[PDB]
Amino acid sequence: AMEMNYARFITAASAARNPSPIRTMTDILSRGPKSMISLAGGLPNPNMFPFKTAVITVENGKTIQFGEEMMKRALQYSPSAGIPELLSWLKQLQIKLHNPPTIHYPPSQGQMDLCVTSGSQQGLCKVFEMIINPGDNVLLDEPAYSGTLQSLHPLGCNIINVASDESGIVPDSLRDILSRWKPEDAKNPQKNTPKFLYTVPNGNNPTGNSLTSERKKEIYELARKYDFLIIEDDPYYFLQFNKFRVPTFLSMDVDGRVIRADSFSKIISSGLRIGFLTGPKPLIERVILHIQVSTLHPSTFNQLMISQLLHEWGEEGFMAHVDRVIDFYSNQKDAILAAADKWLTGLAEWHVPAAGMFLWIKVKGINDVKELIEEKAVKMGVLMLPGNAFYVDSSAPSPYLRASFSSASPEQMDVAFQVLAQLIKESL
Amino acid sequence: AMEMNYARFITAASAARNPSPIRTMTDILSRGPKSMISLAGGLPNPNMFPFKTAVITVENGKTIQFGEEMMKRALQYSPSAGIPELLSWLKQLQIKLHNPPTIHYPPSQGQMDLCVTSGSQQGLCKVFEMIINPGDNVLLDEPAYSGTLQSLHPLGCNIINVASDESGIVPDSLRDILSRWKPEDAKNPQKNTPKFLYTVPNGNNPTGNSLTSERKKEIYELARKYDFLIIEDDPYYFLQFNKFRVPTFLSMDVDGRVIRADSFSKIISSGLRIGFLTGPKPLIERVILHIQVSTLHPSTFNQLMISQLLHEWGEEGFMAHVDRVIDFYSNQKDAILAAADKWLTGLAEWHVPAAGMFLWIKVKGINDVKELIEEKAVKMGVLMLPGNAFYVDSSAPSPYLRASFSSASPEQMDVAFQVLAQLIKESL
Ligand SMILES: Cn1c(C2CCOCC2)nc2sc(N3CCC[C@@H]3C(=O)NCc3ccccc3)nc2c1=O
Ligand SMILES: Cn1c(C2CCOCC2)nc2sc(N3CCC[C@@H]3C(=O)NCc3ccccc3)nc2c1=O
Numbered sequence: 075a076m077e078m079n080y081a082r083f084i085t086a087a088s089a090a091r092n093p094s095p096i097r098t099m100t101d102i103l104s105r106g107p108k109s110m111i112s113l114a115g116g117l118p119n120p121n122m123f124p125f126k127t128a129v130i131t132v133e134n135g136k137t138i139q140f141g142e143e144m145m146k147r148a149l150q151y152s153p154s155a156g157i158p159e160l161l162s163w164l165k166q167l168q169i170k171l172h173n174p175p176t177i178h179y180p181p182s183q184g185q186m187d188l189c190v191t192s193g194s195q196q197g198l199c200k201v202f203e204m205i206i207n208p209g210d211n212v213l214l215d216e217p218a219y220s221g222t223l224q225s226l227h228p229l230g231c232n233i234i235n236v237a238s239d240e241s242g243i244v245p246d247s248l249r250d251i252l253s254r255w256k257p258e259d260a261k262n263p264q265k266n267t268p269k270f271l272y273t274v275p276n277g278n279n280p281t282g283n284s285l286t287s288e289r290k291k292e293i294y295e296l297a298r299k300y301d302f303l304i305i306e307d308d309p310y311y312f313l314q315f316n317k318f319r320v321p322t323f324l325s326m327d328v329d330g331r332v333i334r335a336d337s338f339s340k341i342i343s344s345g346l347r348i349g350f351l352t353g354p355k356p357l358i359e360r361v362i363l364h365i366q367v368s369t370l371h372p373s374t375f376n377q378l379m380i381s382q383l384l385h386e387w388g389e390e391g392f393m394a395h396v397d398r399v400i401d402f403y404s405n406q407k408d409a410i411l412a413a414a415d416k417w418l419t420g421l422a423e424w425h426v427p428a429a430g431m432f433l434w435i436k437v438k439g440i441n442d443v444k445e446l447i448e449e450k451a452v453k454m455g456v457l458m459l460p461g462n463a464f465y466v467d468s469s470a471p472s473p474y475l476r477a478s479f480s481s482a483s484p485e486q487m488d489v490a491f492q493v494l495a496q497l498i499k500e501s502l
Numbered sequence: 503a504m505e506m507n508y509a510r511f512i513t514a515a516s517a518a519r520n521p522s523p524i525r526t527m528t529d530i531l532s533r534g535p536k537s538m539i540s541l542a543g544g545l546p547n548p549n550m551f552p553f554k555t556a557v558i559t560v561e562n563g564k565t566i567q568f569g570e571e572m573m574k575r576a577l578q579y580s581p582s583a584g585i586p587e588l589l590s591w592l593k594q595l596q597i598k599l600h601n602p603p604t605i606h607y608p609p610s611q612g613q614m615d616l617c618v619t620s621g622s623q624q625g626l627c628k629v630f631e632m633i634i635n636p637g638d639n640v641l642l643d644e645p646a647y648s649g650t651l652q653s654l655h656p657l658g659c660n661i662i663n664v665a666s667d668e669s670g671i672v673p674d675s676l677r678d679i680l681s682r683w684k685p686e687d688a689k690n691p692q693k694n695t696p697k698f699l700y701t702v703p704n705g706n707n708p709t710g711n712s713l714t715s716e717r718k719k720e721i722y723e724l725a726r727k728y729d730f731l732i733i734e735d736d737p738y739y740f741l742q743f744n745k746f747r748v749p750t751f752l753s754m755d756v757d758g759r760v761i762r763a764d765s766f767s768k769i770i771s772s773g774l775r776i777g778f779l780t781g782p783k784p785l786i787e788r789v790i791l792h793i794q795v796s797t798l799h800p801s802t803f804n805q806l807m808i809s810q811l812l813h814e815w816g817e818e819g820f821m822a823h824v825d826r827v828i829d830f831y832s833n834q835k836d837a838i839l840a841a842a843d844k845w846l847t848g849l850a851e852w853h854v855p856a857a858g859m860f861l862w863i864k865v866k867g868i869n870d871v872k873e874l875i876e877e878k879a880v881k882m883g884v885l886m887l888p889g890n891a892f893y894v895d896s897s898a899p900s901p902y903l904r905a906s907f908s909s910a911s912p913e914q915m916d917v918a919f920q921v922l923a924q925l926i927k928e929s930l
């Protein structure tokens with residue numbers, strides 16, 4: 075256990091955030107009798123709200139019902155970090171799946187803390203705003219999620235690009251990048267050593283490539299040596315195609331240097347906007363205070379829908395669900411790889427996605443696929459995504475295409491790649 | 503119509519935000535045939551989601567039903583600014599209620615644009631982050647909403663306090679404050695003239711005081727003369743106790759200098775996290791791009807619940823609803839004023855709230871009510887909120903108490919003020 079200095083990863087603005095007056099009140103109300111008349115809060119009267127009951131049908135589960143009182147709770151303000159029954163369910167899930175070393179650490183030493191967020195990306199945006207001053211160095215691997223790049227761009231950090239391949243980030247690249255600094259330079263803020271490494275360790279959007287166990291051990295040792303955070307943005311953790319899931323950065327986080335984002339967006343609902351951050355208490359605390367002044371909390375309604383489903387499923391029923399979803403996406407993956415093999419062998423290069431929704435295709439011989447897709451393929455009713463958007467320099471030419479296998483039938487994929495092959499052939 | 507320079511109210515970070523790759527795609531898909539096979543998106547497959555149908559009962563309205571297809575939409579990603587049917591409903595509401603002069607202006611000249619936000623406060627936090635560099639001057643009236651003060655604190659602006667009274671902000675105070683600068687200094691950023699005036703013009707949290715029509719005309723002329731924005735945070739617009747609602751700043755916004763936040767939190771649901779910003783297109787556009795990288799959008803589910811209710815109600819059914827809510831809060835107001843009259847006449851000063859949920863009570867003779875409330879009243883099962891939290895300098899003594907009349911019965915209020923009166927009497 076290396077002694078962390080979280081002040082180093084919190085901006086002056088972030089550190090200036092004071093606690094809610096609401097929490098001061100609720101703590102006074104606890105040190106005091108339950109038979110209480112409080113006119114001190116700012117809750118509106120929930121009996122004025124026009125939604126009264128809710129019945130919601132479910133796969134392989136008892137129907138979810140909001141009675142009159144539960145509905146009034148669902149329509150009312152709730153805690154910033156999330157409703158307690160969901161938070162505690164999720165805390166038990168994280169202990170079962172990742173058994174983080176930080177569980178029983180003291181708060182100031184990076185004790186594991188959770189925060190339910192309005193989607194996992196709200197969590198990360200908050201994390202990036204917490205950490206980054208202009209001119210700070212951050213590490214990631216291009217191709218990278220376009221949302222992350224669009225989020226980091228206005229913050230004025232320098233993105234130092236780490237090499238990646240079929241197995242995610244190449245730690246051998248990271249090591250060479252870091253040799254620029256001496257390990258002692260982490261103790262000196264004028265030397266400007268990397269604040270963090272961001273990655274999507276399973277099923278990277280857009281590549282489909284997942285890190286291996288061994289590479290995560292190497293990355294963690296480098297993060298320990300040069301004393302940076304690892305931001306583990308892991309929305310396809312529950313869409314891994316291999317039988318045994320790869321150990322997370324969180325699971326090996328002896329130092330309390332890992333902030334993890336989990337997403338319900340591909341397994342439970344994207345539209346509900348319920349994800350969660352898991353990380354060291356001092357950093358999670360900063361994120362929570364920012365949420366207090368922006369969204370206040372994620373939808374109470376949508377949390378109670380998800381929490382009731384998860385409590386009646388149990389961990390067993392939840393993991394049975396993710397297994398059915400993995401099976402679906404694994405068949406879709408096999409279908410798109412078949413269409414790839416049939417139409418693009420000799421015209422394009424690609425790897426087998428280890429997780430997620432995307433096949434990432436390099437077109438041989440064509441420097442920029444943007445003209446082929448946007449001017450020709452579109453007019454023929456086919457579209458894949460040019461790779462341009464997944465690099466910091468998006469105006470640079472890209473031969474790559476991101477192709478989602480989430481929705482399309484085998485009949486549609488076949489047509490799509492036949493058209494692509496035809497267009498590649500008439501462009502060379 | 504004064505020609506605005508919105509660049510003046512956008513930070514370098516905010517201006518650096520580029521458009522979504524998602525919007526580039528959707529625009530390509532429009533310039534192209536409808537019979538389309540797109541593997542270019544990142545939507546997960548919504549048939550994997552475990553919620554299948556929803557039935558939700560309603561006051562004075564046909565039950566809301568999500569069929570299988572509508573549920574899949576409700577659980578899926580949706581536009582950043584909000585779902586189109588809600589946005590267009592809300593745009594028509596704003597035209598009926600406020601008839602803003604900016605409706606038919608060109609986009610660059612401050613054309614009225616709406617954004618559905620995850621609560622109205624998300625909108626404002628985004629607005630504050632968009633505008634404020636450290637050392638910028640901003641205008642507001644203390645006592646001010648604690649959330650606003652906690653949000654502005656880490657941004658490092660100077661809050662210049664404008665006087666307020668029974669009728670909100672005193673424009674005569676504002677005028678004297680602004681005479682510090684010459685009107686020409688708005689054209690020179692080194693002179694550091696106020697970026698904006700923030701206020702809650704109806705039923706201020708915590709005071710209950712609402713601006714008059716005449717005072718809004720004076721404030722607007724001052725905002726025109728010294729060329730600042732008016733941020734109209736108006737969550738109690740639909741909780742006004744007088745018959746005729748006071749014209750909004752938005753309604754008089756000839757220049758496109760008004761950003762308005764409306765809230766559904768006291769009339770429809772606080773817990774659902776659905777509010778909206780109305781403002782000039784260049785500023786709303788910046789807020790939307792920030793939402794794109796944080797929450798992505800407000801819950802699609804909760805938007806469709808609200809939109810279906812609002813479409814079946816019509817504007818008539820909605821305004822009939824707000825009228826019933828106003829009636830409820832007006833009776834609650836009358837009840838708390840009766841308890842005030844009975845127990846506190848000669849012990850405390852207060853005004854009749856013009857709107858909202860709060861009575862604001864000045865205790866005579868006691869410098870700091872914090873000790874009386876937190877050490878004595880609590881142990882006797884009564885609590886009101888010390889006023890400390892509603893000033894920039896919160897450690898300064900406050901004789902004021904915010905007392906909500908949203909929930910408590912007349913029996914409870916009577917006990918609360920009898921206890922308060924007893925405690926005031928034994929403190930002098
Ligand atoms: C008890 N409570 C809760 C608890 C709901 C259960 O989960 C834990 C939080 N939440 C909220 S949000 C909220 N707001 C936001 C709109 C404006 C209104 C509000 O006046 N704020 C300021 C405030 C200052 C001091 C004390 C009290 C309030 N007030 C409350 C509130 O009073
Ligand atoms: C069509 N569409 C919509 C539309 C839903 C209807 O309302 C208007 C928006 N929304 C979203 S959100 C989303 N995300 C977020 C998680 C990651 C995933 C995603 O890969 N982003 C990146 C992206 C880049 C370029 C093109 C496409 C996607 N993808 C979509 C999406 O593809």
Ligand SMILES: [Cl-]
Nearest residue numbers: 368369796797
């Ligand atoms: Cl946010």
